[PDB]
Design a protein around this ligand. Structure first.
Ligand SMILES: Nc1ncnc2c1ncn2[C@@H]1O[C@H](COP(=O)(O)OP(=O)(O)O)[C@@H](O)[C@H]1O
Ligand SMILES: Nc1ncnc2c1ncn2[C@@H]1O[C@H](COP(=O)(O)OP(=O)(O)O)[C@@H](O)[C@H]1O
Ligand SMILES: [K+]
Ligand SMILES: [K+]
Ligand SMILES: [K+]
Ligand SMILES: [K+]
Ligand SMILES: [K+]
Ligand SMILES: [K+]
Ligand SMILES: [Mg+2]
Ligand SMILES: [Mg+2]
Ligand SMILES: [Zn+2]
Ligand SMILES: [Zn+2]
Lengths: 531, 531
DNA sequence: AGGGTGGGTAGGGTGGGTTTT
DNA sequence: GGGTGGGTAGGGTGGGTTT
């Protein structure tokens, strides 16, 4: 990836107009990181790819150069729902922009074809779906005449990861986008994406066959976010009492988001928050757009303070004043938590990202990812983040962002960097060998053990048939033992076994593959605990 | 890829039943290459991947091992249309096999669930779509019960390339198949595909979590095939006259296939064969499936001695006695020609694969391949194959199948190996310098040159506005002028320019990027012609 | 929006228990 | 069907091009 330091300057001939346009029509004071760098590249008539997290400010990077240059700027966008969002703010700001898709009516298409060749037109941005390029000979005909007339001057490829079959949401219609610049060379092209893997970019650069393209990446770090992991209470009705105590005590009157695992959690937390005086909402997949668009308005217009949903929020209008993102259960992966929690504090003021870590959540979510090839493995990354108490939460998230994460320091903006004066590391081998005793007795008695059943027999609870006749209880609180077993699960000394039935996939605990290392007398397993 | 030499033996303990089941139940005489090798690996309880060309006989490699083992063998298949084709052959040989999909009737699922646990069941093969694994908790429950009862013993994954997001026709449900051996470890799995690229295969091994896996590839070479390229006549009436004299002269009474470029050509060649006494074929994409299944029966029962089909003549075509594959125009790529022409001579007797090369075809196909990644580059591979007159056609086909093509010799069954003539190299610079003078004069007058307009002005015909006022005609046949210009097009001394209009993609010829090398008086471009 | 000693051969998966198109 | 018949104009579900 190229170095953008040499482009963060305001001495170009267009710098006078870009700074003018930035403040008076877009109503923004300064540039976000790499906004100025990328804008300088497009106005100089060269190719640029921009990697920036969702909500980073990618929309401005091709809207602004259109307003200080002539013609329209063509924006390739994968979805109509996203294109309508862009038109709502562009037409709000007094900028003339329109959109074209397969569903556009007959009367509307005639009006835009008219404006695409009128030199006296005010149209500066024309959004189209990739079908309008590959599967429309007519639109390609009008682009050809507009290019000959110097009316088609810039190209914008939003969500450029769809070019590569390596990147998520690969569209076969998106691979055709290489045809634009080969026949329209004088028009600059810009690519935008949230996916950071470099090899997907280079494949997009080959399909979008300009190899000599500058590639800028913004710092995926959000310094105004505070990350924290709290233990999830065993009793649910006591937990939701603790939620209101935190909302009222910390975030009184400020809007936020609550992420839950399942749809039944999303609704039950909503109505149980409303009864306690917190205006809540649900955003989980089904109902009628009309009856789950109101909740968007009610949250934007602040009739409701929190939106308790399951994961499909996708809610940036930049939602600028989001002060807190509390998770009821952990997200499926680290790339899911960063995306979901990263929607807070878009005003760059201090916002909180709170994750509630529950031992029961590990196995219910693990049971459902068994059809994602790396599902449990991505989940264990999230669980490792939860049980980790000694490292900066920002550094744990950074391990998934190798190419796009800058080394900027936490500066005491995580749970672990303020609290937690120094540690000690203790041996936990005997507890691991103890757990094998209950699992080996279960194999002898043809009994299968749920995670709950394993703790019970360990403590001296549950079926006496499952008890180890001479094994003594560990004399530790149940919250510590739920963190001991999960460590053995992450460390692969214990493994998850799944049983498929008609209703659901239920997770059991069985002896792990690394338990044979305990036959070695010199083997030692350790955990980092508090001294 | 692993070496199957140590496995090409019939002295294993199960070999007594293999020879019996192969000849007495499947009613076939001899194993095809790698059929015996792969079966020996499966019967030893080891996972194996088999790469074999389409129509090579990979289907037998999991049908036979089911008959020598207890219980059924589970076959993962991507399409209902493919499973129905196999079940027809399964029913006629007297082996009980069934299939399951989302459209299966409520009565049918209740019957198969019963057989999946009946120790006295006759069922030996159970075909399912990937939805029955990923999106069916109930079928997974019964697969789970069948595994404990030792009735579920083998796993078959047909079209395994769909697991990888790199391979064509990718299904997201195929990435979930990693659960099969993850939860059914004692059951062996076999993977099958027609795509040979190694990175897709290694991805499939990780997707289904078998890193320890044998990988066999069959020789994509078909020695019984004769490859030939003939020049296409200018008049379409004389071409069909030359086609009929080929069927009558060489291929009297035996069935074959004719592939055409366009849908209009398929129906025009059809009716022109009927009037000349040739039993027609009519294969297209837009007619009712009733018609699609008709042309198969009349072709299978030899009521028609040809199916003059378009691209996608519809493989699961399994007709062994196809003695000729005449192409009316060239295929889109080399990977497409091998697939289309390879459907001849499955009885291992000498069949001909003849391609007709037309100068007008180069640009008609170019207009449809310039809209998708890379194919115009793939199209030039075919044109290079056509104009090549000194190299074995088997070597030209081999260059696209590097990893899976054995160096076994042609033995004089291709167009270039029987011509027995060789030639020196002649200079063609003046003709290239001549063509540039006409292309630059057209650009000065703001006129664009079609391929036809370029030939006319060169010969001294066509519009006088386009003549050079000198540059007296080359006095060579138009057949030479077509192959000289196309050679300059491959060598990039000429390039294709496209104009998009409301009805068509029109290809034009313009000065190429390598024309600047002709400013050097020492530059020489040469062509090989016949001596 | 139930629980798994209530059962999965006659109870079935659109009856319900687990997130995006 | 043909492109000097035209595309600020007639529209592409009217037809000239691959599953
Ligand atoms: N410099 C800025 N100051 C304030 N808001 C900005 C700035 N740049 C962009 N934005 C806003 O960020 C919003 C979302 O950015 P977007 O491009 O949607 O990110 P994604 O896509 O990634 C836009 O509505 C835009 O108004
Ligand atoms: N061992 C064999 N001997 C003779 N013919 C065979 C043998 N195996 C397969 N075939 C024939 O090859 C034809 C196509 O093979 P198929 O299994 O469809 O390949 P795919 O799968 O790829 C079938 O009609 C079948 O009759
Ligand atoms: K039930
Ligand atoms: K027309
Ligand atoms: K029930
Ligand atoms: K019931
Ligand atoms: K017309
Ligand atoms: K007309
Ligand atoms: Mg965006
Ligand atoms: Mg097959
Ligand atoms: Zn920190
Ligand atoms: Zn040869």
């Amino acid at each position: 990836m190229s170095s953008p330091a040499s482009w963060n300057k305001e001495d170009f001939p267009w710098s006078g107009k870009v700074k003018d346009v930035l403040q008076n029509v877009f109503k923004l004071q300064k540039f976000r990181p790499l906004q100025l760098e990328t804008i300088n590249v497009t106005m100089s008539g060269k190719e640029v790819f921009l990697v920036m997290p969702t909500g980073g400010g990618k929309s401005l990077c091709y809207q602004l150069p259109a307003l200080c240059s002539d013609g329209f700027t063509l924006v390739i966008c994968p979805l109509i729902s996203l294109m309508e969002d862009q038109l709502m703010v562009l037409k709000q700001l007094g900028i003339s922009a329109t959109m074209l898709n397969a569903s556009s009516p007959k009367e509307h298409v005639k009006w835009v074809h008219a404006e695409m060749v009128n030199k006296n037109s005010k149209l500066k941005l024309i959004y189209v779906t990739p079908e309008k390029i590959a599967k429309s000979k007519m639109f390609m005909s009008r682009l050809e005449k507009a290019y000959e007339a110097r009316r088609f001057t810039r190209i914008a490829v939003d969500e450029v990861h769809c070019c590569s079959q390596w990147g998520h949401d690969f569209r076969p219609d998106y691979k055709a986008l290489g045809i634009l610049k080969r026949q329209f060379p004088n028009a600059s092209l810009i690519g935008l994406t949230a996916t950071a893997t470099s090899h997907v970019l280079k494949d997009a650069q080959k399909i979008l066959c300009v190899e000599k393209c500058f590639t800028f990446t913004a710092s995926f770090n959000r310094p105004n976010l505070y990350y924290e992991v709290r233990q999830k209470p065993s009793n649910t009705e006591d937990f939701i009492e603790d939620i209101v105590k935190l909302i009222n005590g910390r975030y009184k009157g400020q809007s936020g988001i609550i992420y839950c695992f399942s749809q039944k959690d999303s609704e039950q937390v909503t109505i149980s928050l409303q009864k306690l005086g917190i205006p809540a909402g649900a955003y989980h997949a089904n109902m009628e757009p009309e009856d789950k668009t109101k909740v968007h308005r009610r949250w934007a217009a602040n009739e409701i303070q929190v939106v308790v949903a399951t994961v499909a929020f996708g809610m940036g209008i930049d939602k600028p004043d989001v002060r807190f993102v509390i998770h009821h259960s952990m997200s499926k992966s680290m790339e899911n938590y960063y995306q979901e929690s990263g929607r807070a504090g878009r005003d760059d003021m201090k916002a909180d990202c709170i994750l509630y870590y529950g031992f029961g959540d590990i196995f219910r979510i693990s049971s459902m990812v068994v059809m994602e090839n790396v599902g449990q493995q991505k989940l264990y990354e999230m669980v490792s983040y939860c049980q980790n108490i000694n490292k900066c939460r920002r550094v744990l998230i950074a391990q998934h962002f190798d190419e796009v994460w800058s080394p900027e320091a936490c500066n005491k903006m995580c749970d672990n960097c303020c609290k937690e004066i120094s540690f000690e590391r203790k041996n936990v081998t005997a507890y691991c060998r103890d757990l094998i005793k209950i699992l080996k007795q279960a194999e002898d008695l043809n009994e299968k053990l749920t995670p709950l059943k394993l703790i019970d027999s360990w403590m001296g609870k549950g079926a006496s048939k499952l008890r180890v006749a001479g094994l003594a209880p560990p004399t530790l609180p149940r919250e510590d033992l739920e963190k001991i077993i999960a460590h053995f699960l992450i460390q692969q000394y214990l493994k998850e076994d799944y049983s498929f039935t008609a209703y659901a996939t239920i997770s059991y605990l069985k002896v792990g593959p690394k338990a044979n290392l305990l036959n070695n007398e010199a083997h030692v397993i350790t955990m980092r605990v508090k001294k």
